[PDB]
Amino acid sequence: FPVVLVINCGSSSIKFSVLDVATCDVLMAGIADGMNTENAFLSINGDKPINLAHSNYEDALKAIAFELEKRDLTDSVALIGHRIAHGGELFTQSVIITDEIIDNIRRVSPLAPLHNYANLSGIDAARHLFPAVRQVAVFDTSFHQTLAPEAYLYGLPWEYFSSLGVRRYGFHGTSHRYVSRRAYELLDLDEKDSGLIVAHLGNGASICAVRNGQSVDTSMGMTPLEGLMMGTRSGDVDFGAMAWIAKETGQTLSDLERVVNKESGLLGISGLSSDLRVLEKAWHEGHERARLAIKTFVHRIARHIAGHAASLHRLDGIIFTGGIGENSVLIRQLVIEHLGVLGLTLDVEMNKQPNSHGERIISANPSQVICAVIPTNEEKMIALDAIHLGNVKA
Amino acid sequence: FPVVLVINCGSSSIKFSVLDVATCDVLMAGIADGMNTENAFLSINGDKPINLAHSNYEDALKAIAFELEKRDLTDSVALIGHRIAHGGELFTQSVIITDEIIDNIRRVSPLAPLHNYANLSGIDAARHLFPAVRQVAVFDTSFHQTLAPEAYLYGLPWEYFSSLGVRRYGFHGTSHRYVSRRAYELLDLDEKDSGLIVAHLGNGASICAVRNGQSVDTSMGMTPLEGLMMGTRSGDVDFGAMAWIAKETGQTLSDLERVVNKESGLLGISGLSSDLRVLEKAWHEGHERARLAIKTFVHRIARHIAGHAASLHRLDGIIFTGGIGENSVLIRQLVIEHLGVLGLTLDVEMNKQPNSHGERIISANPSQVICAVIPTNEEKMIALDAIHLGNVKA
Numbered sequence: 001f002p003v004v005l006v007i008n009c010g011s012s013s014i015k016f017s018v019l020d021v022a023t024c025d026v027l028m029a030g031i032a033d034g035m036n037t038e039n040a041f042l043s044i045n046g047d048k049p050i051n052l053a054h055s056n057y058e059d060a061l062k063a064i065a066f067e068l069e070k071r072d073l074t075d076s077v078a079l080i081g082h083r084i085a086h087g088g089e090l091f092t093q094s095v096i097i098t099d100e101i102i103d104n105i106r107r108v109s110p111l112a113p114l115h116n117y118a119n120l121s122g123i124d125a126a127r128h129l130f131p132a133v134r135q136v137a138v139f140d141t142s143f144h145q146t147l148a149p150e151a152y153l154y155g156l157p158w159e160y161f162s163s164l165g166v167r168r169y170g171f172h173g174t175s176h177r178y179v180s181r182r183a184y185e186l187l188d189l190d191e192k193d194s195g196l197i198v199a200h201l202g203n204g205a206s207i208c209a210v211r212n213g214q215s216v217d218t219s220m221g222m223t224p225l226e227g228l229m230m231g232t233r234s235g236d237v238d239f240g241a242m243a244w245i246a247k248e249t250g251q252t253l254s255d256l257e258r259v260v261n262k263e264s265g266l267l268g269i270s271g272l273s274s275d276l277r278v279l280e281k282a283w284h285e286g287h288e289r290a291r292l293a294i295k296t297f298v299h300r301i302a303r304h305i306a307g308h309a310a311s312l313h314r315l316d317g318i319i320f321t322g323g324i325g326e327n328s329v330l331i332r333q334l335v336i337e338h339l340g341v342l343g344l345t346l347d348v349e350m351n352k353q354p355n356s357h358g359e360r361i362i363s364a365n366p367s368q369v370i371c372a373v374i375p376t377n378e379e380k381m382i383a384l385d386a387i388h389l390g391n392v393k394a
Numbered sequence: 395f396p397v398v399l400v401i402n403c404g405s406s407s408i409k410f411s412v413l414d415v416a417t418c419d420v421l422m423a424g425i426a427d428g429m430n431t432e433n434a435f436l437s438i439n440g441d442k443p444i445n446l447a448h449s450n451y452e453d454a455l456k457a458i459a460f461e462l463e464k465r466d467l468t469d470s471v472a473l474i475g476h477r478i479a480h481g482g483e484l485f486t487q488s489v490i491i492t493d494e495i496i497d498n499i500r501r502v503s504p505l506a507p508l509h510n511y512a513n514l515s516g517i518d519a520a521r522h523l524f525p526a527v528r529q530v531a532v533f534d535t536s537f538h539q540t541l542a543p544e545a546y547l548y549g550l551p552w553e554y555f556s557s558l559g560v561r562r563y564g565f566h567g568t569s570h571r572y573v574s575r576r577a578y579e580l581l582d583l584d585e586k587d588s589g590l591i592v593a594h595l596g597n598g599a600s601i602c603a604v605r606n607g608q609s610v611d612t613s614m615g616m617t618p619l620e621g622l623m624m625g626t627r628s629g630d631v632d633f634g635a636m637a638w639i640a641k642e643t644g645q646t647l648s649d650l651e652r653v654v655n656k657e658s659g660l661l662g663i664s665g666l667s668s669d670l671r672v673l674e675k676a677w678h679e680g681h682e683r684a685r686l687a688i689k690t691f692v693h694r695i696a697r698h699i700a701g702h703a704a705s706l707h708r709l710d711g712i713i714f715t716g717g718i719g720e721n722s723v724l725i726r727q728l729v730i731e732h733l734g735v736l737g738l739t740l741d742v743e744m745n746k747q748p749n750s751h752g753e754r755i756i757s758a759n760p761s762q763v764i765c766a767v768i769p770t771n772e773e774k775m776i777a778l779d780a781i782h783l784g785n786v787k788a
């Protein structure tokens with residue numbers, strides 16, 4: 001009864017899950033949190049916030065490793081999956097982790113230094129604690145590697161691309177990939193003659209155009225800062241505006257980077273919260289800046305969905321996913337009503353249904369494009385990649 | 395036989411034209427150039443590049459004022475029209491210039507300091523040299539003042555909007571307005587139940603969604619730096635990318651501002667020229683970076699056209715205009731082929747025709763959206779506003 005241990009070893013946390021290989025069901029989940037800090041803890045299933053004060057990335061996983069052993073799981077771990085933030089141009093698919101892969105992840109790390117050096121910290125720990133276990137790296141950029149240069153180039157001087165690697169990469173690749181594969185079933189589409197837009201709407205948020213099974217445009221950039229407005233991120237912002245602000249307030253690029261990344265977005269406009277549930281209720285209670293944040297948020301989503309549609313030969317489906325996309329009856333409806341130009345017709349009884357109803361269509365019959373909600377499952381996508389790679393000879 | 399003197403008094407030049415009131419035809423045109431410099435000259439109709447070494451904004455216009463008098467035109471100048479770069483939120487239409495208007499243009503000047511202080515330099519000169527002549531200010535931002543907050547807000551903290559006025563303004567307002575008014579005739583549309591996208595494609599470039607006669611979205615930002623890739627401007631650029639470059643090369647926000655504004659775009663990608671004719675031929679001659687610049691250029695136009703379409707209830711027309719939009723058979727075709735998702739069908743015999751054929755439809759009958767080329771005429775739009783305002787009592 002083999003299992004897969006999935007790890008996302010972020011800048012300040014290690015989220016993990018243990019999935020059964022035969023059914024891909026979660027048997028255990030958890031989050032080590034407050035990493036590299038004095039107050040570090042490990043909450044499995046939100047059941048016993050066990051203190052692990054002053055603990056590194058390997059300590060957290062050595063904690064977790066014991067918890068699997070306390071449950072006799074350690075000896076069924078046949079595979080380990082690692083979520084990697086950034087694969088630059090080197091990674092176009094998931095790979096069995098070897099010394100070469102480590103070097104290569106290390107080479108692309110300058111593109112996402114905070115997050116990639118935490119991913120490597122996690123691989124290092126896992127390799128120690130599970131030496132006879134095959135391990136697999138799954139990159140959030142890799143699905144977007146099929147973008148053409150016209151879709152990934154910035155209008156900067158060519159020098160910045162060829163010597164410094166400045167180009168669009170895009171993220172949420174594992175979600176976009178997973179969700180698009182699931183849409184071909186739900187919508188009864190032929191992958192190889194199909195056109196989808198996937199709106200991954202969580203705390204971080206991005207659109208992806210998937211033409212014939214392949215990503216052909218996505219909204220995030222070299223960094224997660226491009227495209228949609230999100231929880232705390234501004235989304236697309238006029239560089240001339242940012243330069244004008246600099247002069248006016250004395251702020252530096254670094255300062256404004258923090259603002260754009262940590263204090264902007266739903267949080268920034270509303271002045272209340274990055275949380276959409278909080279803001280939905282605030283609007284309901286007559287809050288005006290909450291209403292503006294959401295309307296702005298919706299408008300930028302509508303605008304990118306339509307804009308990413310231009311990279312398709314035909315639009316068969318729009319799929320919503322993520323915490324916001326799976327759960328917000330309002331935002332889904334607002335966005336879809338903002339896309340009447342594309343011929344969309346919402347079915348509000350279908351749109352009203354909670355996420356418990358799973359993969360589900362939410363558009364009427366007259367609708368020229370199918371709209372659906374498809375809960376993402378990144379941990380399952382990582383495990384399926386791991387399972388496949390478990391049959392390989394290295 | 396009254397005439398209107400139209401002036402665009404830019405950062406380094408004064409373009410002018412003299413239009414007949416009864417027919418709106420150009421009787422005289424010219425460009426004072428190399429302003430605030432040692433080598434300053436005045437080329438009327440490209441006929442006698444008259445040297446005017448070391449001359450201010452009033453000297454240039456005093457030169458021009460004499461040339462009108464040498465042609466007995468000075469005494470038929472019934473109206474003067476001034477092109478203003480930026481009207482902030484104060485100007486929503488064209489106005490008879492008074493002391494109040496001057497103060498107000500001066501108040502909004504921090505939003506576009508280079509260009510607005512040159513506009514005021516031009517008003518100052520014209521007011522002196524033509525004291526009994528009614529004068530009119532026409533702002534490139536004013537047409538976009540009908541944008542809703544959701545369409546003009548950035549995802550920055552609310553503070554930056556309410557105290558510093560950081561919002562989208564958009565430009566090419568006079569062109570977008572002019573061209574959209576002309577499209578209602580060409581396409582036999584009712585202005586009040588209509589949806590247009592106008593692609594103003596020149597050296598500077600922007601899209602505008604015009605719903606029921608009103609601008610509801612546009613691609614430029616607080617500054618001309620947002621949206622489309624253009625001649626020397628990058629267009630939309632990931633702020634995270636720009637911050638990453640800063641760290642890597644030691645460059646400042648100011649440095650990167652210059653790069654983004656003056657060295658990027660068609661120029662930047664190709665390494666050859668900001669000129670599209672040069673690049674069309676370069677591609678034809680097998681040049682790869684010329685081909686990439688154009689493809690990138692086209693792709694970002696297609697993406698914004700479709701994205702601005704989301705702000706319409708229905709898409710009746712896409713209109714091309716500007717030096718590139720009026721004259722590039724290739725780019726028009728490429729862009730339209732990149733929008734097959736919207737149901738466009740090009741008529742290539744119609745698309746092949748040069749600009750001499752004027753306002754013209756370039757789409758087939760099956761096409762679900764009419765596509766057209768409509769030569770812009772900003773000087774005529776300014777004069778028509780002036781003519782109307784000549785009937786007012788101040």
Ligand SMILES: Nc1ncnc2c1ncn2[C@@H]1O[C@H](COP(=O)(O)OP(=O)(O)OP(=O)(O)OP(=O)(O)OC[C@H]2O[C@@H](n3cnc4c(N)ncnc43)[C@H](O)[C@@H]2O)[C@@H](O)[C@H]1O
Pocket residue numbers: 008010011083085086112115171201202203204205223224231274275276277278280322323324325327328329
């Ligand atoms: N610089 C960088 N470079 C490279 N990689 C980087 C990076 N920075 C970060 N990364 C990486 O990017 C990856 C993804 O990061 P994120 O983009 O931040 O993660 P996410 O997909 O938004 O998922 P999350 O769980 O945070 O939000 P959820 O969908 O629950 O959605 C939460 C939202 O859903 C809403 N919601 C939930 N239920 C709701 C309901 N019933 N109604 C309305 N809203 C609801 C909530 O209110 C909330 O607003 C991470 O691995 C991270 O390490």
Ligand SMILES: Nc1ncnc2c1ncn2[C@@H]1O[C@H](COP(=O)(O)OP(=O)(O)OP(=O)(O)OP(=O)(O)OC[C@H]2O[C@@H](n3cnc4c(N)ncnc43)[C@H](O)[C@@H]2O)[C@@H](O)[C@H]1O
Pocket residue numbers: 402404405477479480506509565595596597598599617618625668669670671672674716717718719721722723
């Ligand atoms: N920071 C700021 N804030 C506020 N306001 C500001 C500002 N900076 C500037 N402004 C103002 O914005 C206004 C507009 O500026 P711009 O945006 O720069 O002007 P434009 O509309 O591009 O017109 P231009 O004449 O330069 O180019 P054209 O259409 O001929 O098109 C030229 C192109 O067409 C191409 N072309 C011509 N014929 C062609 C053919 N046959 N085939 C292919 N291409 C052709 C050419 O190759 C060339 O590439 C100005 O008043 C300016 O002062």
